[PDB]
Amino acid sequence: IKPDVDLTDGNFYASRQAREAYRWMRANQPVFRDRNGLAAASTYQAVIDAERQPELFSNAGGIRPDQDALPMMIDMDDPAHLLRRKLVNAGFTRKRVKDKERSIAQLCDTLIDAVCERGECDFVRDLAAPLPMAVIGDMLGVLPEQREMFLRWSDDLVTFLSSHVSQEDFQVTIDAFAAYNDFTRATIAARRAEPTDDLVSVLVSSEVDGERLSDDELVMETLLILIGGDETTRHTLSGGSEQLLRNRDQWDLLQSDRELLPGAIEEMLRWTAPVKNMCRMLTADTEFHGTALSEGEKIMLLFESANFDEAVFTDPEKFDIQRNPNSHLAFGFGTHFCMGNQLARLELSLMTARVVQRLPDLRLADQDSRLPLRPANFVSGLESMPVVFTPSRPLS
Numbered sequence: 001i002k003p004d005v006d007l008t009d010g011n012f013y014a015s016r017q018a019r020e021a022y023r024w025m026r027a028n029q030p031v032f033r034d035r036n037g038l039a040a041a042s043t044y045q046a047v048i049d050a051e052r053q054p055e056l057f058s059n060a061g062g063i064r065p066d067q068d069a070l071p072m073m074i075d076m077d078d079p080a081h082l083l084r085r086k087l088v089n090a091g092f093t094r095k096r097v098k099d100k101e102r103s104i105a106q107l108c109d110t111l112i113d114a115v116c117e118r119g120e121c122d123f124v125r126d127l128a129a130p131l132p133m134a135v136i137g138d139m140l141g142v143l144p145e146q147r148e149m150f151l152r153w154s155d156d157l158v159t160f161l162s163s164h165v166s167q168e169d170f171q172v173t174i175d176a177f178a179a180y181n182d183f184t185r186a187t188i189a190a191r192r193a194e195p196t197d198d199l200v201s202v203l204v205s206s207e208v209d210g211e212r213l214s215d216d217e218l219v220m221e222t223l224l225i226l227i228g229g230d231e232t233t234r235h236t237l238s239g240g241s242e243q244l245l246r247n248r249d250q251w252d253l254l255q256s257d258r259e260l261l262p263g264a265i266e267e268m269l270r271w272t273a274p275v276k277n278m279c280r281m282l283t284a285d286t287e288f289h290g291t292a293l294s295e296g297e298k299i300m301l302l303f304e305s306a307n308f309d310e311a312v313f314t315d316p317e318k319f320d321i322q323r324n325p326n327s328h329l330a331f332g333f334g335t336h337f338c339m340g341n342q343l344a345r346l347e348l349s350l351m352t353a354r355v356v357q358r359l360p361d362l363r364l365a366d367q368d369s370r371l372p373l374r375p376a377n378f379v380s381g382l383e384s385m386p387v388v389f390t391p392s393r394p395l396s
């Protein structure tokens with residue numbers, strides 16, 4: 001009954017055997033070691049305990065299992081992490097995010113306008129994937145005419161930061177970083193010359209304790225915002241909508257009562273957990289929930305496993321938009337708790353509301369399909385999602 005798994009193999013997260021493996025871990029070895037000896041916290045309690053002990057469970061070795069740390073806030077410990085976060089968080093105040101509703105809602109209606117006359121689309125390719133990229137592109141000063149070029153960068157940049165870059169990909173990947181770097185430094189220079197109220201303008205002016213973000217830091221932190229908030233948000237939108245359609249009583253409940261939308265978004269986040277893991281590196285030997293851990297090794301925090309922990313969530317394989325409490329760990333916990341969580345929730349809220357209203361009879365093309373998942377060991381979710389609906393006229 002024990003799973004024979006490599007937690008650094010993206011195929012594990014795409015196999016649809018992962019939650020069965022998680023169940024074995026939570027029941028039998030809550031701090032699990034995989035077939036290569038990699039440690040992983042599988043229970044909600046173990047994930048929370050590690051998050052609450054950043055001096056023992058550090059981010060400064062990097063958040064990926066077999067990669068060096070990068071000079072960005074997520075690979076830093078406090079108090080230096082706080083300064084970097086304080087500087088960047090000026091772009092993500094509650095007002096600034098709330099003020100994005102008008103533009104985000106307009107993006108949602110434009111995306112739905114593009115497919116509403118067809119009566120079919122791919123929910124991932126045509127709705128869930130374009131929205132987070134357009135939202136982040138808008139904040140970074142990407143013209144809609146530059147969205148094609150910017151979109152190729154964003155896909156190739158995921159490969160750049162991934163665990164293995166093939167010989168055949170090395171060129172396009174370093175070319176994507178260079179292109180992103182050059183583009184971003186141009187935007188930075190433009191806002192230092194002529195400030196506006198976009199994200200880069202806010203970041204170039206941000207000052208904490210007489211310290212500002214350097215140009216190097218601005219490229220790194222905007223890159224973290226782009227990669228961190230693009231595919232993740234996409235996967236919650238698609239996988240959450242998949243669950244509304246597979247449990248159509250939940251779709252009907254939400255369609256009938258807009259006040260259920262916040263709870264629905266939280267259940268979509270709990271269920272989809274697009275960030276499958278973040279690593280911590282041990283700063284000392286320790287005994288952790290029955291497993292001996294050694295100084296210098298990394299442990300994965302399995303957020304999806306935690307989100308299906310029966311110790312915290314009653315009937316966790318039931319998708320329930322009215323679930324309360326719903327203290328899921330899709331955004332993590334503690335000092336690195338997702339900086340983009342309010343923006344992600346707003347994108348998800350606005351798009352889901354518009355889909356339920358404008359594609360009211362949305363359905364999966366084939367409910368017996370096992371839809372394909374991205375075989376990546378870090379962020380994963382649906383690769384495609386064919387849907388059908390009654391055509392309607394665009395709002396234009």
Ligand code: HEM
Nearest residue numbers: 073074228229232233275278331332333336338339340344
């Ligand atoms: C549904 C979408 C999202 C998910 C599931 C998600 C998930 C996460 C997770 C799990 C972490 C690490 C927390 C931890 O280790 O405890 C994180 C950190 C972060 N996320 Fe997100 N995220 C999402 C959307 C976004 C967006 C839209 C942004 C854009 C600003 C963003 C920017 C960040 C940043 C900058 C960090 C690093 C925070 C820090 O180190 O202090 N994320 N996110």
